[PDB]
Design a protein around this ligand. Sequence first.
Ligand code: MK1
Lengths: 99, 99
Amino acid sequence: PQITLWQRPLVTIKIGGQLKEALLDTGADDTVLEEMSLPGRWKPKMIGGIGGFIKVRQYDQILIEICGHKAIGTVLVGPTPVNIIGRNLLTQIGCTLNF
Amino acid sequence: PQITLWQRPLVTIKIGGQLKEALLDTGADDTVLEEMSLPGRWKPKMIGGIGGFIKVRQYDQILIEICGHKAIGTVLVGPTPVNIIGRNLLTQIGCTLNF
Ligand SMILES: CC(C)(C)NC(=O)[C@@H]1CN(Cc2cccnc2)CCN1C[C@@H](O)C[C@@H](Cc1ccccc1)C(=O)N[C@H]1c2ccccc2C[C@H]1O
C-alpha cells in the first residue's frame, strides 16, 4: 500500500493480542511504545528527542504485527504520548520513502 | 528517489545558498531546522516531542530545496540536534511511504 503524509501515518499494530494504534516514524531510530508490562528482562536506556531525554526499558526480540505483517525487533517502553514504530521495525516490513 | 530505512534517511537541502543535511521525518508534523539565521520576522511557536516541549521561532514562506525538489513553506528554527524535514514539506515534494 501507499501511505500519504497529509495526515499522520498511523497504523494498527498487534502487540501481544492487544490492537493499538501506532505512528510510522522514519525519523525514529528505535521503536517506543507506551508504558506497559512486557515479558522479559529489561535494560534502562536513556533516549532523547525534541524536548529532552526520557528513561525507558529496553526489551529485546519482541514481535509486533505492523499492519498485518509480522516483524521482530527491540522495543523500548517508556513515558511516550504516542506509539512510535521506528526504522528498526520498519525495515522488516520493507517500508520505503519515495518522491 | 526510493529511500530505504536501513540507515538514517538523510538528504541534502539547500537553504539560503547553503547545503546542509536533513533527516526526512514522517513522525514530525513540522520542519524544524537547527539554530540558524533566517530572513524576515518570526512568530513564537511551541512544539513538543519526546521528553517535553521546546520554544521555537516560526518563520513563514521560506524557500528550501529538498534533494533537488523546491519547496516553500513554514520552517521552525529551534534547539534541535538534527535538521528535521516534517510532513509540511514532505507533502510538497510528493513524498510517500510504501510497502
Ligand atoms: C527514537 C526516538 C523516538 C527517541 N526518536 C526521536 O524522537 C527523534 C529524535 N531526533 C532528535 C535526536 C536526538 C538525539 C540524537 N539524534 C537525533 C529528532 C526526531 N525525533 C523523531 C520524531 O519523529 C519523533 C516524534 C514523536 C511524536 C510524534 C507526534 C507527537 C508527539 C511525539 C516527534 O517528536 N514528533 C513531533 C515533532 C517533531 C518536530 C517538529 C514538530 C513535532 C510535533 C511532533 O510531530
